[PDB]
């Protein structure tokens, strides 16, 4: 159990991550090295080059034929218990919305396992425990972050039709979107247009301007078009596509990647862990305050993450049948701080961009004294 020898292995893994962040926060706030237009070029390098190449490195060295299917089915059961109690609020009550059910699912069930999670668990329980964290990253990239593009695109395509077709929208038979438009929130004018056919059935065409509900076979084609257009423009979907594809070929016929290719990838992916933390300290220096939303809600964004998160996974991991040390890994990976990728979605689409801003930043600062309190209490 907890000797003082383990407390030094945990600090060797985590103190390097805060040193990279406070030199970035110091650089803009205290010593003014970077202009705010120069910070925008460092965040754009990390988001497009360093982090997509870091997750290719982890996914392509995973063995998909030896995954731990009992550990990995207790994490899929967490996000069904959560997402099914948010369906029973939106339907029995009158004050439930759809903006709040996207926020309360991402503040409960989506932690930061790629950057903080793999170094932390591997220093606490060994090298098997940092291989279980790669298998969770495979499921977040390929399943759970694609159900949250379906929810943001359905939320945007309903604020357009119900706003411009308030008394007529039951007769729309086809919706066509022009290829110049990617996202149909309010950024462009979005001149929509209807063609009345011979029966009285409308034929909607969304154009970009210059200077009841529709049937469920019509809304389901509008969304699949627009989910597709934002999924090929995303760097983190090629990192997941080619990572799983190489991993199925390598571990069946025992093919190693050659040394020209494995060093061409590793020259930029070694820059990935250190500048993912450097870029997160440039974010907290460009916000006006750290607690950005107010004290009433910052105490609510940190109680969904560190209390409701690891309590709905104690129920899910005991029903499947995990015991011993795998139960202790699974309750400590749920108390990690808030991930970064849900913070990118809430900034683009403006759905609480401040509650998800003070959960990434203020969650990193208080996450260690809270993941160390579970580890001294589980191994009691």
């Amino acid at each position: 159990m907890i000797t003082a020898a383990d407390f030094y292995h945990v600090m060797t893994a985590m103190v390097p991550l805060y040193v990279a962040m406070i030199l970035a926060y110091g650089s803009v706030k205290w010593w003014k090295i970077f202009t705010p237009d120069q910070c925008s070029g460092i965040n754009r390098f990390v988001a497009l080059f360093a982090v997509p190449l870091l997750s290719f490195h982890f996914i392509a060295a995973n063995n998909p034929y030896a995954m731990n299917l009992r550990f990995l089915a207790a994490d899929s059961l967490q996000k069904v218990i959560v997402l099914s109690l948010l369906f029973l609020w939106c339907k029995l009550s009158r004050n439930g919305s759809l903006d709040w059910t996207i926020t309360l699912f991402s503040l409960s069930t989506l932690p930061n396992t790629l950057v903080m999670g793999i170094p932390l668990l591997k220093g606490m329980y060994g090298n098997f425990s940092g291989d279980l964290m790669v298998q969770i990253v495979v499921l977040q990239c390929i399943i759970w972050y694609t159900l949250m593009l379906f929810l943001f695109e359905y939320r945007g395509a309903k604020l357009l039709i119900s706003e411009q077709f308030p008394d007529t929208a039951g007769s729309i038979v086809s919706i066509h979107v022009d290829s110049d438009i990617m996202s149909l929130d309010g950024r462009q004018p979005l001149e929509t247009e209807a063609e009345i056919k011979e029966d009285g059935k409308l034929h909607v065409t969304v154009r970009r301007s210059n200077a009841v509900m529709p049937p469920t076979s019509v809304m389901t084609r509008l969304i699949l078009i627009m989910v597709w257009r934002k999924l090929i423009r995303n760097p983190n979907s090629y990192s997941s596509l080619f990572g799983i594809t190489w991993s199925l070929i390598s571990f069946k016929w025992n093919i190693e990647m050659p040394a020209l290719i494995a060093k061409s990838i590793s020259i930029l992916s070694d820059a990935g862990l250190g500048m993912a933390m450097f870029s997160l300290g440039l974010f907290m220096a460009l916000n006006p305050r750290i607690i950005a939303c107010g004290n009433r809600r910052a105490a609510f964004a940190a109680a969904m993450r560190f209390v409701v998160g690891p309590a709905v996974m104690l129920v899910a991991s005991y029903a499947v049948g995990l015991r011993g040390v795998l139960l202790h890994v699974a309750i400590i990976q749920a108390a990690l701080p808030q991930g970064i990728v849900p913070f990118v979605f809430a900034k683009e689409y403006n759905v609480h961009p401040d509650i998800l801003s003070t959960a990434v930043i203020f969650g990193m600062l208080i996450a260690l004294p809270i993941t160390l309190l579970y580890y001294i209490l589980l191994g009691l």
Epitope: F165, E193, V204
Partner: nanobody
Framework: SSQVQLVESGGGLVQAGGSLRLSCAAS????????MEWYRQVPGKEREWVAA????????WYADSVKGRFTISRDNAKNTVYLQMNSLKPEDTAVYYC????????RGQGTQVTVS
Amino acid sequence: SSQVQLVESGGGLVQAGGSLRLSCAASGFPVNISWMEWYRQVPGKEREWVAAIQSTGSYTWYADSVKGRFTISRDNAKNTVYLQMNSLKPEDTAVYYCRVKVGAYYRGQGTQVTVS
């Protein structure tokens, strides 16, 4: 609802240098705001807009080539506007159809605009 309908009339083959009278009889709507338009369509691309009988008749944005020569009426109780052309030039064989706004632009297709 009663199957919201647009009907258009006034097409024909005439001689260059005359006058035509188009119509756009809207029916079966909610509260209709006046932004009613007309525009041309050749078989080629890059179409352009013609007239406007917008909110209260304060400004009617005409095209640059037909400035001060097209009479556009309004009758809010009858809910039908007229596009009166004068001194028909031969380059008027496009497709003219109205674009009434009830928040989203509705239109039809049915005209026979041509001239010799």
